[PDB]
Design a protein around this ligand. Structure first.
Ligand SMILES: *[C@@H]1O[C@H](CO)[C@@H](O)[C@H](O)[C@H]1NC(C)=O
Length: 118
């Protein structure tokens, strides 16, 4: 499913995927697992997620036990949208819940969605 917002094209994937498989699946659709750099793009995706009702992988990850989180598509930005204190602490790869808020978890976990953008 393809959506437009701002000057951005989003693709919403519904498939059983680990975070690594979401990286792959987005690329197979000529896109990249999403980076979320401000409150406006976040609010657009919150509406999308709340209408779908289930968690989607996003392109944020850490290799230093959560000291630093980076976007897989290379974007540099200060914006964060964590659910709570604990959510930044629980794992290496990040998803957005059905209310748009971010959580970290094991990259080998399975979710049924990913958000990509071009
Ligand atoms: C997702 O794929 C994994 C790996 O094959 C499988 O073990 C798991 O049961 C699947 N989950 C769903 C909901 O299809």
């Amino acid at each position: 499913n393809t959506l437009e917002y701002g000057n951005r094209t989003y693709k919403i994937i519904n498939a059983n995927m680990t975070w690594y498989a979401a990286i792959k699946t987005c690329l197979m659709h000529k896109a990249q697992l999403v980076s979320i750099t401000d409150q406006y793009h976040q609010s657009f995706l919150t509406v999308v997620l709340n209408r779908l009702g289930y968690a989607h992988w996003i392109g944020l990850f850490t290799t230093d036990n959560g000291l630093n989180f980076d976007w897989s598509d290379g974007t540099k930005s200060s914006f964060t949208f964590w659910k709570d204190e604990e959510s930044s602490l629980l794992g290496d790869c990040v998803f957005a819940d059905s209310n748009g808020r971010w959580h970290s978890t094991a990259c080998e976990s399975f979710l049924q969605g990913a958000i990509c953008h071009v």
